[PDB]
């Protein structure tokens, strides 16, 4: 009477339908769900993925070391959501977003909500005010450590010694997640990993995020022997909508936001477009330059190819068939 594959599928089958799409996958599953997504302004992170970028009406984790680009993604994924018309909002509790770098990744900072809330409580209970009125596509909560308890802004003991900062972020995603799928607005947590879990609150965050970002620094792109950016990893460590742990590679220069020449070159490498022989790059026969910088010069400024290659790339993967 068994067979495997068929006693598997319906077992599978139960499980999405008890508790949604994702709830259990094959890693090497290709999911066909397009769901609505946000592009991540990173090529390979998005297709890292598996849908094109964050999903919306989803709670997202970014999580990280300080200075990982965490903060860079996320200003790119308002940038990009405000492209597609639509409106964003910054709870900032850090003060240090800088907006001048923010339009450079192209960022409508002028249109941009920014709210500097006074407690954990209120940062949260005003984010959450401004999601259900539907009319956000994107909220960006910029530090989960800064979310501090109002007990705990106070002047308050010695005594109350608890977990309150992690159960007031429990609660506070256990309302807000509902509205936010009403809504469709996603949800972008940025977590500095520099109290017991992922920077306090992440703890509940780690159960109530759909996606979870693991941005950190791994290179520092020199060229010759100078300065010119950092190359950043991140890991899709959970992913509710498409096969979790895959990875993605991306640089950002000094000043500049998600290199799109160096994704292209990346990109382009390992999918065989450019053939990158030792040391010398070159793409359908013509030369593209010595040592990955000279290449994204080249690029960069031969607007024309690259362009080819964005689309040779954009096709192989998919971009938006359905």
Request: charged residues 25%; negative net charge; proline residues 3%.
């Amino acid at each position: 009477a068994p067979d495997r594959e068929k006693a598997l599928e319906l077992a599978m089958a139960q499980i999405d339908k008890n508790f949604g799409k994702g709830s259990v996958m094959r890693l090497g599953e290709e999911v066909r769900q397009p769901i609505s997504v946000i592009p991540t302004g990173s090529i390979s992170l998005d297709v890292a993925l598996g849908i094109g970028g964050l999903p919306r009406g989803r709670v997202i984790e970014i999580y990280g070391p300080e200075s990982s680009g965490k903060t860079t993604v996320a200003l790119h994924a308002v940038a990009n959501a405000q492209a597609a018309g639509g409106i964003a909002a910054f709870i900032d509790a850090e003060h240090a977003l800088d907006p001048e770098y923010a339009k450079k990744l192209g960022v409508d900072t002028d249109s941009l909500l920014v709210s500097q809330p006074d407690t954990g409580e209120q940062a949260l209970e005003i984010a959450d005010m401004l999601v259900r009125s539907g009319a956000l596509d994107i909220i960006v909560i910029d530090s989960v450590a800064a979310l501090v308890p109002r007990a705990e802004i106070e002047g308050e003991m010695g005594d109350s010694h608890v977990g309150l900062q992690a159960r007031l972020m429990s609660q506070a995603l256990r309302k807000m997640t509902g509205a936010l799928n009403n809504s469709g607005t996603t949800a972008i947590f940025i977590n500095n990993l520099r109290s017991p879990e992922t920077t306090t609150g992440g703890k509940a965050l780690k159960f109530y995020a759909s996606v979870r970002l693991d941005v950190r620094r791994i290179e520092t792109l020199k060229d010759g022997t100078d300065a010119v950016g950092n190359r950043t990893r991140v890991k899709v460590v959970k992913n509710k909508v498409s096969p979790p742990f895959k990875q993605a590679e991306f640089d950002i220069l000094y000043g500049q936001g998600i290199s799109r020449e160096g994704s292209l070159i990346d990109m382009g490498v390992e999918h065989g477009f450019i053939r990158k022989s030792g040391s010398w790059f070159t793409y359908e026969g013509e030369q593209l330059g010595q040592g990955k910088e000279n290449a994204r010069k080249f690029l960069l400024e031969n607007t024309d190819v690259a362009n080819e290659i964005e689309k040779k790339i954009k096709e192989k993967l998919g971009i938006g068939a359905v």
